[PDB]
């Protein structure tokens, strides 16, 4: 293909790049002279301005550093496409972040914000605003976070509508910010409103972390309401996104997924595949692995022993503390049903001793099971007894015969009376 960009500009740019490791006073002068060579715009002088800002930040020269950063901001909306300029300005912002003069940092940030507003750098702009919002959430700031969210929403507003069809990614980032915020304020109603609006309008390309956060919030909301399948699916997608990304929230999301998969009954395992030699043997996940192993084996005694042994990491989460009662009820119900499947007419105290629980709890569980039609049996409370209907007759054909007999014979009687 090839294209002659320029020879002398690159040559002097590389000469100054070599000079950068020498005394900075000469490197800055050479870089400033690279901008004088072309004069109009920059191209290689665009990178020369970035190098000048870096070297000036080395020798604490800020005023002209910010003036030349304004020059670069004007250069972003210039013959240099807004493609590598975003990486260059992200690097400049990171270099400025090295020091601790927060006043200078925020002056830089506000100048960048206004320049990007003027340059209508839509994608770059809400990327910068989303980064600022993430920084605010990391410092638990909402005074300017709310303003940023309102501005981004207004930019997403299609006048009549509050949402575009391709700014779905914009609204996705906005809702991720608001999900972090309402996780800070644990506002369930706003959480569900955000999740609904996200599910509806967010349909677009996500960043894996954003999708994971939104799915984590959705699973939290669903398991707060009661939906086990939806919560399991949301935790599934969030944990897949965390696996892709690498955020520390991966372990917590996996624990939440383990809790969700145990609550959907029907005997499924969440530690089977992804929790392998790397993750199954993880010290923070080995407790959950053992829990679900007992759940598979229906070992109520071992399950309760593990619950009591690792209570500092089993029920430590208030949500898992809430759900542990339901999990115990479910596992006890499963063990009871499995125990009473092979036979009939079994005493209650034996079941209580087997389940290592009180007799009243066993009676309540039996009543609940019979109400759910899971047990084809009935309870004799006087003698502390559970009598099951063995129904070994397997008939009910005589019932059909009797119905056939009476209906047609009455049919015959009606016909004879009418015909006579």
């Amino acid at each position: 293909s090839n294209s002659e960009p320029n020879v002398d500009l690159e040559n002097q740019y590389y000469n100054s790049k070599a000079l950068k490791e020498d005394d900075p006073k000469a490197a800055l002068s050479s870089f400033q002279k690279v901008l004088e060579l072309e004069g109009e715009k920059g191209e290689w002088g665009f990178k020369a301005l970035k190098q000048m800002i870096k070297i000036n930040f080395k020798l604490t020269n800020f005023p002209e550093m910010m003036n030349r950063y304004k020059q670069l901001l004007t250069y972003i909306r210039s013959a240099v496409t807004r493609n590598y300029s975003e990486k260059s300005i992200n690097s400049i912002l990171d270099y400025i972040s090295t020091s601790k003069q927060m006043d200078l940092l925020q002056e830089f940030y506000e100048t960048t914000l206004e320049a990007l507003k003027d340059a209508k750098n839509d994608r770059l702009w809400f990327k910068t605003n989303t980064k600022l919002g993430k920084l605010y959430l990391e410092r638990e700031e909402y005074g300017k976070l709310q303003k940023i969210l309102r501005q981004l929403h207004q930019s997403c507003q299609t006048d009549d509508g509050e949402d575009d069809l391709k700014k779905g990614t914009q609204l996705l980032e906005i809702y991720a910010l608001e999900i972090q915020m309402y996780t800070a304020q644990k506002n369930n109603k706003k959480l569900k409103a955000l999740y609904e609006q996200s599910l509806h309008i967010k349909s677009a390309i996500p960043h894996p972390l954003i999708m994971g956060v939104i799915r984590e919030c959705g699973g939290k909301m669903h398991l707060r309401e009661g939906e086990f399948e939806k919560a399991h699916t949301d935790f599934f997608e969030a944990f897949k996104n965390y696996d892709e990304s690498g955020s520390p929230r991966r372990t917590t999301c996996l624990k939440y997924l383990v809790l969700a998969n145990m609550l959907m009954k029907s005997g499924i395992n969440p530690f089977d595949s992804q929790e392998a030699k790397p993750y199954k043997n993880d010290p923070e996940i080995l407790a959950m692995t053992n829990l679900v192993s007992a759940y598979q084996n229906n070992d109520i005694t071992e399950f309760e022993k593990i619950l009591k042994t690792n209570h500092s990491n089993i029920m430590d989460d208030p949500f898992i503390r809430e759900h542990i009662e339901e999990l115990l009820r479910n596992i006890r119900t499963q063990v009871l049903i499995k125990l009473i499947k092979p036979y009939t007419r079994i005493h209650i105290p034996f079941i209580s001793k087997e389940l290592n629980i009180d007799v009243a709890d066993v009676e309540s569980l039996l009543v609940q099971c019979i109400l759910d039609n899971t047990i084809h049996g009935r309870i004799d409370q006087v003698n502390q007894l559970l009598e099951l209907d063995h129904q070994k007759r397997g008939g009910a054909r005589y019932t059909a015969l009797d119905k056939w007999t009476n209906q047609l014979n009455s049919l015959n009687q009606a016909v004879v009376s009418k015909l006579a």
Binding site: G143, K144, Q146, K147
Partner: protein, 112 residues
């Protein structure tokens, strides 16, 4: 450029700024205990002040206004309304700031 939400059920002083968009506490108004103050916040003479009345058990109501400072967070004693000129107002009364003409209006007769 600041909104001063005073009272509620009390002596809650929660200051909000439009340019900052945040709610903060300043102080508590000095009021006698075992009482239910009736707070009234209004701008007077380009200066933030309050008009509050305290009522106790088997006690008469007292009317007094205080001068509040922004950076001091204290309600300095500006003027105490003597009962010889102003009598009891009530509970559902409202307060507002405006300019009036003494000649057109008439003084309200009441025994001190």
């Amino acid at each position: 450029d600041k909104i001063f939400y005073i009272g509620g059920l009390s002596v809650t002083v929660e200051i909000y700024d439009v340019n900052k968009n945040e709610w903060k506490m300043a102080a508590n108004i000095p009021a006698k205990r075992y009482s239910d103050p009736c707070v009234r916040a209004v701008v007077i003479s380009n200066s933030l002040c309050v008009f509050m009345r305290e009522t106790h058990l088997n006690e008469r109501a007292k009317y007094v206004t205080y001068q509040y400072d922004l950076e001091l967070d204290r309600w300095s004693l500006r003027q105490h309304i003597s009962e010889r000129v102003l009598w009891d107002l009530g509970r559902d009364f409202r307060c507002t700031v405006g300019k009036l003409y003494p000649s057109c209006l008439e003084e309200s007769p009441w025994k001190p």
